[PDB]
Symmetry: C9
C-alpha cells in the first residue's frame, strides 16, 4: 500500500460518513417532529402515524453524534496535511 492508497481510503471513509450523517440528520428531524407534537398534546400526527415518545437527552445525544462526524472529518483532513511538516 502506497501513501496514495491510504489517503484514498480515508477520503472514501469520510465520504461514507457523510452518507451516515445525512441519514442521522433525517432521523433527528423525526425526533424533533415527535417531540414538538408530544409537547403540544397530539397523540397522532397529520399523516395518521403515532406520536412516538422522545426524551430530551436522546435529541441532544443525536445532535452530538452528528456534530462528531464533522469533527472527525476535520481531524482526518488535518492529519493528512500533517505528513508534510
Amino acid at each position: 500500500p502506497s501513501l496514495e492508497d491510504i489517503r484514498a481510503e480515508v477520503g472514501q471513509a469520510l465520504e461514507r460518513a457523510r452518507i451516515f450523517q445525512k441519514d442521522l440528520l433525517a432521523i433527528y428531524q423525526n425526533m424533533l417532529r415527535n417531540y414538538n407534537a408530544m409537547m403540544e398534546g397530539l397523540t397522532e400526527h397529520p399523516d395518521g402515524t403515532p406520536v412516538i415518545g422522545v426524551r430530551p437527552a436522546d435529541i441532544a445525544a443525536m445532535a452530538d453524534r452528528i456534530m462528531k462526524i464533522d469533527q472527525e472529518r476535520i481531524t482526518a483532513l488535518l492529519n493528512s496535511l500533517k505528513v508534510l511538516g
Copy 2:
C-alpha cells in the same frame, strides 16, 4: 450525477458488477463493469488529494454553524424542560393550555445545560485551533 451515484453505491457495499447492472436499469444504456471501475478510480484520485487548509476552515465554519442550529433547538427544549419542572413542582398534572405536565428530573436539566455549554466550548476550541495552526 452519474459519477456521484456510482461512488455512493460503491460506498454502501455494492461491488462494481452489481453497480453496472443496477445502473444499466436506471438509465437506458448498458454500462460495463470496467466503466464503473474507471469512474471509481477517478473519484479515488480526487479523494486522495491533500486538502487545503482553506477548505479545512470552510468545514470548521460549516460544522460550527450546524452546531449553532442544534444548540438553538436544545435551548428551546431546555425552556420546555423548565416549564414542565416548575409545573411538576407546583403539583399540577396539566398546564394552562391543557397539555400534560411531563416528568423532569434535576439531573436531566443539568445534563441538557451541560450539552448546550459543551457546544459553546467546542466552538471556541475549534476556533482557537484554526488560529493555532499558524
Copy 3:
C-alpha cells in the same frame, strides 16, 4: 437574493436537505422559481466566507457570551439545588407533602452531590476558559 435567503440555503443544507428540496422550499418565499444551480452557487459562496481565519477578538466575544450563558444555567441549577434539599429534608422528617400542599418528591444524597458538582464545574469551566484566553498570548 437577500441576506436572509443565503442564510436559509445554508441552514437547510446543514439540516440535511439535498439541493432540489432546498430549491422548492425557497421558491415559495420569492416570486421566481429557484433552481438547483442557484442553490449550489449560494452554498459555495457561503463556504468561501466560512474559510476566513478567525479574529481572536471575536473568539473572546464567544468566550464572554458562553460564560454568560453558563451563569444563566448556573443560576437555574442553584435554585433547583435548593428545591432538592427541600425535598430531602421533608423526606428525612417523614413527610409526603410540603407546607404548601405540594408533593414531596424523592431525592437521593447522590443526586444532591451530583448537582452540587455540576454547579461547581461551571465555575471551574469559567476559570479555565478565562485562563485559556490569556494563555494564547504567551
Copy 4:
C-alpha cells in the same frame, strides 16, 4: 436603553430567542414598541464589551468565589453524610423508626463511601485551584 433593559436583551438572546421575539417580549412589558434593529444594536455592543481581554486578578477573584461556593456545598453534604450514618446505624440494629418518630430510610454502604469521597474531593480540588493561580504566574 437602560442597563436592566440591555441585560435582558442579552439574556434572552443567550436563552435562544431570536431578535424579533426579544423585541416583542420587551415591547409588551413597557409602554413602548422596541424594534429588531435596536435589539441587534444592543447585542452588537454587548459583544464588543465581552471581547475584552480578561484580567488575571479578576480570575483569582473567580477562584476565590468558587472555593467559597464549594465550602457552602461541602457543609450541606457533611450534614447529609451524618443523616446517612444515622440511618445506616438504625437500619443496622433492626429499626424502621428513629427515637423522635422520623422514619429510618435505607442507606447502602457504597452510598456512604461515595458521599465521603465527594466531600474529600472538595478538599482536594480546593488545593489544586490554589496551586494553579500561583503556578500560572
Copy 5:
C-alpha cells in the same frame, strides 16, 4: 457580617436585586442594588489576593484529618459488611445480638476496601506534597 450575608446569598443563586429586597426587610432600611453590587465588588477584592503556600499547607493538612475520620467510619461499616456476609454465607437470617442479617455482595465488600485503601494512597501523596 453584612458583607458575608450578601456574598452568601449571591453564591446561593440570588441576583443583586433579590439580595437588596430581602436584606432591606431584614436590616429595616432601603438596601439598594448599587450597595449590594458595591459590597460584592469589595468581597471579590478580598478574594482576588494571591494565596500563601503556608495557607495551602493548612488546606492540605485539614483535608487529611477529615479523611481519617471518614476512613474510620468506613472501616466500621466494612466490618459490618463482613459480619453480614459471613452470616448470610452460613444460612442465618439473624445475628447473635438479635439484629437482622442484611444482604451484601462480594463486589460491595471489595469496593469498600478499595475506598479505604484509596484514602491511605491519597494521604501519602498529600503528605509528600506537604513537604514539596
Copy 6:
C-alpha cells in the same frame, strides 16, 4: 504433520487451562497410546522454546493481511445490518408492524442506528487504516 498436530493439541489444551494429567488422559485417545503427564510437560517445555522465536517480517505481513481481510468482511456485514435497521426504523415511523415482504417490523431506536453508524465508521477510519499503515511500513 502427525507430531506437529500432537504438539499443537497439547499446547492448545494447556492454553485453555487443562492440567497436564487431563491433557495426557485426553490425548491418549487421539494417539492410541498411554500418554504420560511427564511427556506433556516435556512437550510444553519444547513448545515454550519454539514460541520464544521472533516473528519474521513475512510472518507479520501475513498476520496483518489476514486481519485486514477480517475487517473488510465485518465492515460489509455491518453495512447490510445498518440498512436493515433503517428499514425497520422507517417502517416503524409510518406505523407498520409488518414489512412489504411479510416479515415483522423489529423496533429500532435512533441511538441504535447512530451507534451502528459509528461502529462502521471506526472500522473504516481506525481498524482498516492502522492495518494498511502496518502493511506500508513492513514492505
Copy 7:
C-alpha cells in the same frame, strides 16, 4: 471531641505543620499492611464465590453442609480476582516508589 466536630461540618455553636520522612515511611508501611489484611478477606470471599459457582453448575440449591447456594456470575469472579491482583500491583509500585523517594 472538639476538632472532630468542626471537621464534620458543625460550627462552634498545627495540623498545617509538616510531617517527617520517617512518618511518611511509616504511613506507607501501614497502608501496605492494611491492604494485605483486605486482600486476605477478599481471597476467602473469592473461594466462597467459586464454591457457589461450582454448586450452581451442578444444579444444587444447597451445599452439602445445608447452607444455601448463592448465585454468582462469571464476571463477578473475574472482577474479584482483578481486585486481589491489583492489591499486589499497588504494593509493588509503592515499594519501588519508597526506594526512589524515601531512602
Copy 8:
C-alpha cells in the same frame, strides 16, 4: 515432593495461612506436616519466584499469549457466525432453523460488539508482533 510443594504454594497464595496449610496437607498424606516444614517450603518457593526472567523467557510469554488470543479469536469468530445466522433467520420470520435448532434473537449492537472484540484481538496481535522486534531480541 514436587506436587506437594506446588500445593503448599498454591494454598498460601490463595490466603490459607501456614498452620491451616500444615493441617490440610497433614490429612492429604497422613503424617504430621509442621508449620516449620510449610514455612521452609514457602521460603524455598519465594527464592525460585524471585529469579528474574531472561529475555528468552519474555519472548516465550509473548508467543504463548499470542497463541492463547488466537484460540479465543476462533471461538469468538464461530460465535459471530452463529449470531449472524440467527440474525438473518429472525429477520425473515423464522423461529426454527432448517436443522430443527431454535432461532434465538440477536440485537445488531451485539453483533457489532463481537466484531469489534475480534478486531481488537487483531490489533493486539499485530502490536505484540511488532513490539517483539522493536522491544525484544
Copy 9:
C-alpha cells in the same frame, strides 16, 4: 515452633488497621493473652510496629513480591479458563436446543458478550505478566 509474641504484635496492629481504638484492642486481647493489657501497652506496641513497618524493602524483596504476584495471577487465570470453558459449553448447548448436558447438569444461558469479556480478562492477565516481567528485567536486575 511457638510464635505467640509476634502473633500478639500482629493482632494489635491488625485491629488498629481495621479501625478499633487502642482501648478496645487492649480489652479484646486481654482474652487472648490471659492478662490485663492496658491502653498504654497497646500504644507502645503500635508505636514499635510503626517503626518496624517504616523500614524500606530491599530490591530482593521486590523481586520476590513480583514473583508471588505473577504466580497468584496464574492461579486465578486457571480458574477463569475453566469458567470460560463452562460458558462456551453452555452457549453451544443452548445453540442446539439442549436443556441438559451429557453429565446430567442443567444448561444455563450465557451471552456472547460475556464470553468475549471473560476471554479479555484472561488475555489481560498474560499482558500484565509480560509487562511485570519486562519491568523486573529493567529495574530489578
